[PDB]
Design a protein around this nucleic acid. Sequence first.
RNA 1: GUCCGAUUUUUUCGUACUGGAUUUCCAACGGGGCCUUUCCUUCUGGCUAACCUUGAGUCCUUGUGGCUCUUGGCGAACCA
Lengths: 81, 186, 150, 129, 87
Amino acid sequence: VLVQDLLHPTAASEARKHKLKTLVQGPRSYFLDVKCPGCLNITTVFSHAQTAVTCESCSTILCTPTGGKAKLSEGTSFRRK
Amino acid sequence: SAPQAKILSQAPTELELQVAQAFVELENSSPELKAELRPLQFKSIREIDVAGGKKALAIFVPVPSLAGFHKVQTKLTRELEKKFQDRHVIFLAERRILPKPSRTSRQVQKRPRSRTLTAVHDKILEDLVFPTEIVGKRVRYLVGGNKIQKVLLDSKDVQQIDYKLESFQAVYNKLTGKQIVFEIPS
Amino acid sequence: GRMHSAGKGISSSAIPYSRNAPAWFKLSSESVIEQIVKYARKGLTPSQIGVLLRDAHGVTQARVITGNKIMRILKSNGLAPEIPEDLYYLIKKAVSVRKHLERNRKDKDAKFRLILIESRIHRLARYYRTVAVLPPNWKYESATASALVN
Amino acid sequence: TRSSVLADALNAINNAEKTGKRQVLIRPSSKVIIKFLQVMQKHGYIGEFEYIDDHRSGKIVVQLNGRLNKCGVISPRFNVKIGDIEKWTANLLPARQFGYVILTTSAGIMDHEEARRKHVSGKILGFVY
Amino acid sequence: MENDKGQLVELYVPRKCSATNRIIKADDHASVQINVAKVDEEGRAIPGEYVTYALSGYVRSRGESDDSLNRLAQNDGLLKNVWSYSR
RNA sequence: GUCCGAUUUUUUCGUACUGGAUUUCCAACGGGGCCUUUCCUUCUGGCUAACCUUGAGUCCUUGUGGCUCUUGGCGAACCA
Ligand SMILES: [Mg+2]
Ligand SMILES: [Mg+2]
Ligand SMILES: [Zn+2]
């Protein structure tokens, strides 16, 4: 208060702000590489996917959509990038 | 018809030809270095003094070419620096700049945004570091009146320019007239 | 704030400081384009195209990774629609509301909402007329509206 | 909807001064702002200021050094003939001995002292004291 | 304030607060003047000699009179690790 | 340098007026030009290259039209 480093906010406070209200606005979302423990297909998704994403075939289901972060369907793997 | 005086446009000068045979050197490595290196010639080089006891090499590539030079930029810059001690190597695609149109200096047919002073100067900097993108800039208006543009380079693979960083500044300053300062994430 | 509501929401996207990137993509513009057109020929709108590409195909944006925004591509490929997607969905909407009015005739709120929606449609089409993407006359007609959404 | 941008800039500064702060945030960042900020720094009513590159229109962090009383905008940017600068300075400046009324002339943006010298005029941007 | 022949007119030149550079009014009776002791070779507080800040009424009333005062001490050395620019 | 009331009030002590070009002796300021990819756009004048062109001449580990001079066309660039 009164005198502070506006050009250099902390990190733990910059991560507390709203998506648009940081020093330069940036997305809080990511991407997951997701497969099921049966198949060998590296199907990459979005954190907040709005579509019931599947593997290229096998009529499987990777995620169900919601009001925010998508819901990875049951037993499935994921690395974040 | 020619392996040496061919791999470059317009005749002067010597340092170029010196570099040219450094290019044909790698060209003796058929499947890879001889592959995507014969299409890649360059226009001109300007030598510039740096802060230390060396100098940097501004190789002015054209523009449609700049794509391929980038694909070899990793390897080639390094091999160039092996065959050149006391020289930092940077590739700078020369871009055309058009004047801001005026009641005097008028030209019909608009004027693309890419032929813009501030837009080209903006690319010079992108190339003047090639790998590692930028995550932010600032510009400091010093309490006496002068800009100092702070560039914020990625943490990923900065190793390829961590040292050139001190030299990049003098390059930019020579070309434009504006002073740079670099920096890193925290 | 809102144009027709009295709402003051800020819920938007947030495009990253990254006109290039991503370092993990690896797929080349030329490829992703041929997937956009693949979907656009399967009858899909730019909005809901980049929704699939953002989701299942890990392509973050289209202006990056291809240098061109989605609709601009469709037009080049002659998969440009008749009237724009906004205008369209507005006109579709206004249609359905009116179709509700035609049986439920005491729905005074319905009538109110139509007056809002059709204000929007005209405001839009006005602009679209202004920048040559609709013919000088055009204008949204109610009686003929159901036709224009097929 | 935003209208002047050079209004909300000067106001934030003005506001931040009054409440004892020595730094402000200025969104968005118009060139007219900066040139104004330049004129406003040339006589040290503000200190260092730094542009922030959003991929958009900008932000600015200006450092404040007290001694600012009011940095104002005048809207609409009226037409000022040369012998009318005399009149605005009369009206909206504290004393004959200081303060500034920065303009927009074809010869760039500048304080009224300067325009007085180069013998130029145009619209009025605002004032500082 | 000068004059005709440079001679220093104007009755008196007022203090300026040390957190906002703002003039301390002759009736600003919430304006405060702190006097901190300089200490010679270990322990012993040097009498007569002070490190001195001045804090105006407005800063104090708004309760900024501690944080601001703290920055001031740490930056004339009198503090280590208490105030912290970036927050 | 001298008009002029010359001021705390002692003697060889200090309060509006004029002269000033160039010193590198600091400062401020203002007019006009250039260079840095930047006099563009129209037109006209100048100086002409290159360019095919007629005619006489050579060279070629190849008709290669390369080089020269020669006839009259056509005027990039450039300067104003
Ligand atoms: Mg709002
Ligand atoms: Mg309204
Ligand atoms: Zn699977």
